[PDB]
Design a protein around this ligand. Structure first.
Ligand SMILES: *[C@@H]1O[C@H](CO)[C@@H](O[C@@H]2O[C@H](CO)[C@@H](O[C@@H]3O[C@H](CO)[C@@H](O)[C@H](O)[C@@H]3O)[C@H](O)[C@H]2NC(C)=O)[C@H](O)[C@H]1NC(C)=O
Ligand SMILES: *[C@@H]1O[C@H](CO)[C@@H](O[C@@H]2O[C@H](CO)[C@@H](O)[C@H](O)[C@H]2NC(C)=O)[C@H](O)[C@H]1NC(C)=O
Ligand SMILES: *[C@@H]1O[C@H](CO)[C@@H](O[C@@H]2O[C@H](CO)[C@@H](O)[C@H](O)[C@H]2NC(C)=O)[C@H](O)[C@H]1NC(C)=O
Ligand SMILES: CC(C)/N=C\[C@@H](O)COc1cccc2ccccc12
Ligand SMILES: [Fe+3]
Ligand SMILES: [Zn+2]
Ligand SMILES: [Zn+2]
Length: 341
């Protein structure tokens, strides 16, 4: 009680966690796994308490009895009167992004192109676009739709991993952690920016955060918003300013999950942790900021303003929404209920 073990995915999340652990006075400690699924297993066993998950994994976790505790909440124009912790979460926009110079590439001509996914089983990077594609083609052969992909977490020797690059040394090709060059929102967008892939499946925010000087990372320094287009489902292409009307779906925010028996305790610690290291935390800019990691989205997305209370004490199914749960169920038919472990 009062002590929470956080599960870090990969070495860079471990390093961030160790620092947070140090600054928390060991009120938070760290477990590390190579994959998010392994972190989920550590939580089930009771060897870790919590990690922040994409909605695709909240679905995995939820079937195993884990619960949403607090959600990532980003910058808002509406509800602005309300305190961030009490403000409802809005959801992010899942988009398909292409290079402008790649003229005449539309939603309807993606077959045999090269693709960049955040990771297998993630909302924007996988579940939404491949759910749409399985539906549209009436085929479960989503391994044969694109000529080559980087989809971290797929078989490293299938074409779904052909475009993945591994780490500094070429090791760890296609691992679903940040050692993979093209892992996650930032990695998938980089995959597109370097013209390894033709399309990246990311969220609206990723384009903005890595273009027009917002990043300063060497691959992203010279990236310009006007050089990218969104692919809409009507066959159109739009500027990245038109995400409201050109997206694949609205995605439930990333959320902290814990075993239901630990939820209350995890919630209490985390609220106090963000008072100290969150956006206006006592200690953030000065000693440690929970929600920064130079564009890398380690443990939390860099654009998190705060972690919000849920309210309505939602199950994972109500948190994800029936719309999203049925999408995943339908897609998982290709690869009807149980915990995977
Ligand atoms: C790909 O297609 C599948 C199969 O249709 C989609 O599942 C279908 O989509 C709709 C939208 O969620 C579901 O209909 C709804 O269901 C409830 C009660 O059934 C109803 O009250 C709603 O107003 C709405 O009519 C439908 O259940 C579902 N069909 C099946 C067989 O499950 C799936 O969503 C698609 N995948 C993606 C990413 O679009
Ligand atoms: C580690 O956790 C303990 C217990 O929650 C914290 O101790 C409390 O600190 C606050 C602020 O200093 C006080 O108002 C309480 O009276 C303390 N006692 C309790 C409730 O046990 C401690 O601050 C935490 N350390 C860090 C740096 O996060
Ligand atoms: C797409 O994402 C971007 C980046 O998150 C959003 O632009 C931000 O909007 C907030 C408040 O709405 C502003 O205060 C920020 O300055 C913007 N960020 C940057 C870096 O430009 C944009 O609103 C999103 N669009 C949609 C349709 O959701
Ligand atoms: C008690 C419940 C209803 N309240 C908190 C959560 O459900 C919020 O979850 C959600 C978070 C983000 C997007 C979402 C889209 C549809 C439905 C729920 C979403
Ligand atoms: Fe996501
Ligand atoms: Zn919409
Ligand atoms: Zn409920």
């Amino acid at each position: 009680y009062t002590r929470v073990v956080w599960c870090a995915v990969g070495p860079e999340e471990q390093k961030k966690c160790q620092q947070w652990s140090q600054q928390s006075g060991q009120n938070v400690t760290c477990a590390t796994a190579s994959t998010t699924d392994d972190c989920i297993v550590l939580v089930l066993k009771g060897e870790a308490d919590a990690l922040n998950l994409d909605g695709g994994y909240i679905y995995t976790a939820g079937k195993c009895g884990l619960v949403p505790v607090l959600a990532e909440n980003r910058k808002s124009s509406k509800h602005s009167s309300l305190d961030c912790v009490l403000r409802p979460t809005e959801g992010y926009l899942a988009v398909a992004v292409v290079k402008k110079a790649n003229e005449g590439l539309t939603w309807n001509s993606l077959k045999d192109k090269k693709s960049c996914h955040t990771a297998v089983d993630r909302t924007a990077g996988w579940n939404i676009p491949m759910g749409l594609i399985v539906n549209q083609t009436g085929s479960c052969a989503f391994d044969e739709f694109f000529s080559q992909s980087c989809a971290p977490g797929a078989d490293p020797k299938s074409r779904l991993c052909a475009l993945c690059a591994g780490d500094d040394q070429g090791l760890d090709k296609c691992v679903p952690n940040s050692k993979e060059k093209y892992y996650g929102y930032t990695g998938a967008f980089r995959c597109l920016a370097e013209d390894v892939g033709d399309v990246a499946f990311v969220k609206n925010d990723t384009v903005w955060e890595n273009t027009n000087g917002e990043s300063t990372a060497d691959w992203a320094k010279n990236l310009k918003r006007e050089d990218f287009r969104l692919l809409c489902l009507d066959g159109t292409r739009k500027p990245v300013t038109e995400a409201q009307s050109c997206h694949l779906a609205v995605a439930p925010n990333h959320a902290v999950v814990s075993r239901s028996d630990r939820a209350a305790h995890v919630e209490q610690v985390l609220l106090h942790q963000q008072a100290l290291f969150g956006k206006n935390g006592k200690n953030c800019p000065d000693k440690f900021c929970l929600f920064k990691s130079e564009t890398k989205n380690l443990l939390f997305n860099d654009n998190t303003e705060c972690l919000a209370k849920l309210g309505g004490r939602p199950t994972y199914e109500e948190y994800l929404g029936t719309e999203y749960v049925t999408a995943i169920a339908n897609l998982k038919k290709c690869s009807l209920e149980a915990c995977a472990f």
